[PDB]
Write an enzyme that holds these catalytic residues in place. Structure first.
Site, short mmCIF file in Angstrom:
data_model
loop_
_atom_site.label_atom_id
_atom_site.label_comp_id
_atom_site.label_asym_id
_atom_site.label_seq_id
_atom_site.Cartn_x
_atom_site.Cartn_y
_atom_site.Cartn_z
CG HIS A 11 -33.74 2.20 -18.40
ND1 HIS A 11 -34.73 1.24 -18.58
CD2 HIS A 11 -33.46 2.22 -17.07
CE1 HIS A 11 -34.98 0.66 -17.43
NE2 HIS A 11 -34.26 1.26 -16.48
CG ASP A 15 -36.65 7.63 -7.93
OD1 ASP A 15 -36.31 7.22 -9.06
OD2 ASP A 15 -37.54 7.06 -7.22
N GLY A 180 -39.80 -1.53 -10.25
CA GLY A 180 -39.89 -2.21 -8.95
C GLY A 180 -39.39 -3.64 -9.04
CG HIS A 210 -37.79 -1.51 -15.27
ND1 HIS A 210 -38.40 -0.25 -15.39
CD2 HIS A 210 -36.54 -1.27 -14.81
CE1 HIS A 210 -37.52 0.68 -15.05
NE2 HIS A 210 -36.39 0.10 -14.69
CD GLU A 213 -33.24 -4.57 -13.36
OE1 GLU A 213 -34.48 -4.22 -13.30
OE2 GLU A 213 -32.36 -3.89 -12.76
CG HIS A 234 -32.76 -3.62 -17.07
ND1 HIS A 234 -31.47 -3.16 -16.89
CD2 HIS A 234 -33.52 -2.97 -16.16
CE1 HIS A 234 -31.46 -2.27 -15.91
NE2 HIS A 234 -32.69 -2.13 -15.46
CG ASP A 291 -31.28 1.22 -14.20
OD1 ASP A 291 -32.42 1.75 -14.26
OD2 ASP A 291 -31.07 0.03 -13.82
CG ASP A 292 -31.49 3.42 -10.57
OD1 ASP A 292 -32.39 4.17 -10.14
OD2 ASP A 292 -31.74 2.43 -11.31
N1 LIG Z 1 -33.78 -0.61 -13.18
C1 LIG Z 1 -34.65 -0.72 -12.18
N2 LIG Z 1 -35.35 -1.89 -12.02
C2 LIG Z 1 -36.37 -1.95 -11.13
N3 LIG Z 1 -36.77 -0.98 -10.31
C3 LIG Z 1 -36.01 0.12 -10.42
C4 LIG Z 1 -34.96 0.33 -11.28
N4 LIG Z 1 -34.40 1.59 -11.11
C5 LIG Z 1 -35.12 2.14 -10.15
N5 LIG Z 1 -36.12 1.29 -9.70
C6 LIG Z 1 -37.17 1.59 -8.73
C7 LIG Z 1 -36.80 2.38 -7.50
C8 LIG Z 1 -37.28 3.83 -7.80
O1 LIG Z 1 -37.66 4.49 -6.61
C9 LIG Z 1 -38.48 3.62 -8.73
C10 LIG Z 1 -38.87 4.82 -9.60
O2 LIG Z 1 -37.78 5.40 -10.31
O3 LIG Z 1 -38.03 2.50 -9.56
NI NI Z 2 -34.42 1.04 -14.40
#
Ligand SMILES: Nc1ncnc2c1ncn2[C@H]1C[C@H](O)[C@@H](CO)O1
Ligand code: NI
Length: 360
Positions: A11, A15, A180, A210, A213, A234, A291-292
Site C-alpha cells: 500500500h 504520486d 480519494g 481504501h 481509514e 487501512h 502509503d504516501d
Molecule cells: N491513503 C490514501 N487514502 C485516500 N486517498 C489517498 C491516499 N493516498 C493517496 N490518496 C489519493 C491522492 C492520490 O493522488 C491518489 C492516487 O494515488 O490517491
Molecule cells: Ni493510500
C-alpha cells in the site's frame, strides 16, 4: 533499522512517493511554478509533521503534481526512481498504486492540475509507468507491480481504470483500487465504481479498496459486500464493529496497515491504541506500509520503528506479517511461491517444508 530484513509493501502511492529533487528539476525544466526553490523548502511546504485531516492531506498534492503530470519523461522516471528508492528500505516486492488519470493531460475529464489539453492519455501513462517499473526491477532487484486507482469523486473514470487493468495485466498491473475522499456519501455505491469492480470480479482482476481509514465500519462493509474487495486499504475502523471484524478474520481478509500515515491524517488518534495491536494479538492477516512517504516524510523504517518502539512488535511478528503480505499479494501463484521462497531463505526458515505446509 527496526527490521533490517526483506520486506513486502502492498500500500504505497506512486504520486505520494516522488523525489523532491525530481519535482524541482521538472518544475524548472517545464517552467511550472512550485512553492519552493529547493528540495528542503519543498519538503517544508509539502510535508506533514502533525496530524491534520484527510482532505488537508489530499491538498498537498496540488503543490507538486503540476510539475510531473503531463510529462512522459517525468512519469517513466518517477516509476524507475520509485523502485530504486524502495530497494534502500530493504523491500523485495512492492505493489505501487496511482491514478493514471491524475498524470494525464488528455482523455481525462476534467483535466487535472489546471493543465492545458495535451497529447498524454491515461492509457499511455499506464504504459510508461509499467516501463519504468520493469527497468527498475531489472536494475535494482526489487520486484515491482502496479495497482490502478479509481477515485471516489470521479466514477466516470472507473470504467477506463478497469479497462486499463485488463489491457496492461502483462505490463505490471495486478489490481484495481479505490482511493480519494472516503467521506463522500454513497461514494462506494456510485454505478461507475460498482460496475468497474463487478467487471474486475468477472475478468479476474484483483481488488483492493481504501476503506475504514477515516470512514466508519459501514464503508468497510460496502467495500467487502458490494465491491467484493480482497484486501482493505487501512481498514482501521473495522474494529468499531466486533461482528464485522470477526467475519473478516474468518475470511482471512488482508488489512493493508499504514501506522505513521494513520497518525498524520488523523485516521488514528494517538491517545487510543492502534488497530494494528489487535491484529497482531489476534494473529490476523496484515502488512505494514508507508502509503504516501513523500508527504509523511517517511520510509518503511518509520513504520517498523514505531511498531517496535511503541507497540512491542518483535522480529518474529515482522517476519510473520511479511509472509502474510506475500501470501496476500496480487502476484500469480508461481511468483507468489518464488517470493515466499525468497523470504523463507532470507529469514532462515526451511524453504521446502514451508512450501509444503502452504499446500494446505
Ligand atoms: N491513503 C490514501 N487514502 C485516500 N486517498 C489517498 C491516499 N493516498 C493517496 N490518496 C489519493 C491522492 C492520490 O493522488 C491518489 C492516487 O494515488 O490517491
Ligand atoms: Ni493510500
Amino acid at each position: 533499522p527496526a527490521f533490517d530484513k526483506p520486506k513486502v509493501e502492498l500500500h504505497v502511492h506512486l504520486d505520494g512517493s516522488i523525489k523532491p529533487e525530481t519535482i524541482l528539476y521538472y518544475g524548472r525544466r517545464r517552467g511550472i511554478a512550485l512553492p519552493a526553490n529547493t528540495a528542503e523548502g519543498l519538503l517544508n511546504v509539502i510535508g506533514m509533521d502533525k496530524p491534520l485531516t484527510l482532505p488537508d492531506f489530499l491538498a498537498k498534492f496540488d503543490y507538486y503534481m503540476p510539475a510531473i503530470a503531463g510529462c512522459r519523461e517525468a512519469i517513466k522516471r518517477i516509476a524507475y526512481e520509485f523502485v530504486e528508492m524502495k530497494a534502500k528500505e530493504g523491500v523485495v516486492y512492492v505493489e505501487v498504486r496511482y491514478s493514471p488519470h491524475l498524470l494525464a493531460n488528455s482523455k481525462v475529464e476534467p483535466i487535472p492540475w489546471n493543465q492545458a489539453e495535451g497529447d498524454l492519455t491515461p492509457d499511455e501513462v499506464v504504459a510508461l509507468v509499467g516501463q519504468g517499473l520493469q527497468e527498475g526491477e531489472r536494475d535494482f532487484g526489487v520486484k515491482a507491480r502496479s495497482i490502478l486507482c479509481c477515485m471516489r469523486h470521479q466514477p466516470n473514470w472507473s470504467p477506463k481504470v478497469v479497462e486499463l487493468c485488463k489491457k496492461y495485466q502483462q505490463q505490471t498491473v495486478v489490481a484495481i483500487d479505490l482511493a480519494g475522499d472516503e467521506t463522500i456519501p454513497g461514494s462506494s455505491l456510485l454505478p461507475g465504481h460498482v460496475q468497474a469492480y463487478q467487471e474486475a470480479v468477472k475478468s479476474g482482476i484483483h481488488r483492493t479498496v481504501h476503506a475504514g481509514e477515516v470512514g466508519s465500519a459501514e464503508v468497510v462493509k460496502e467495500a467487502v459486500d458490494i465491491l467484493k474487495t480482497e484486501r482493505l486499504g487501512h481498514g482501521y475502523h473495522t474494529l468499531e464493529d466486533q461482528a464485522l471484524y470477526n467475519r473478516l478474520r474468518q475470511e482471512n481478509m488482508h488489512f493493508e496497515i499504514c501506522p505513521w500515515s494513520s497518525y498524520l491524517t488523523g485516521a488514528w488518534k494517538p491517545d487510543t491504541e492502534h488497530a494494528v495491536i489487535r491484529l497482531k494479538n489476534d494473529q490476523a492477516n496484515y502488512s505494514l506500509n508507508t502509503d504516501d512517504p513523500l508527504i509523511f516524510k517517511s520510509t518503511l523504517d518509520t513504520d517498523y520503528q514505531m511498531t517496535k518502539r511503541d507497540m512491542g512488535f518483535t522480529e518474529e511478528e515482522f517476519k510473520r506479517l511479511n509472509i502474510n503480505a506475500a501470501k496476500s499479494s496480487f502476484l500469480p501463484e508461481d511468483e507468489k511461491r518464488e517470493l515466499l521462497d525468497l523470504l523463507y531463505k532470507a529469514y532462515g526458515m526451511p524453504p521446502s517444508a514451508s512450501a509444503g505446509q502452504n499446500l494446505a
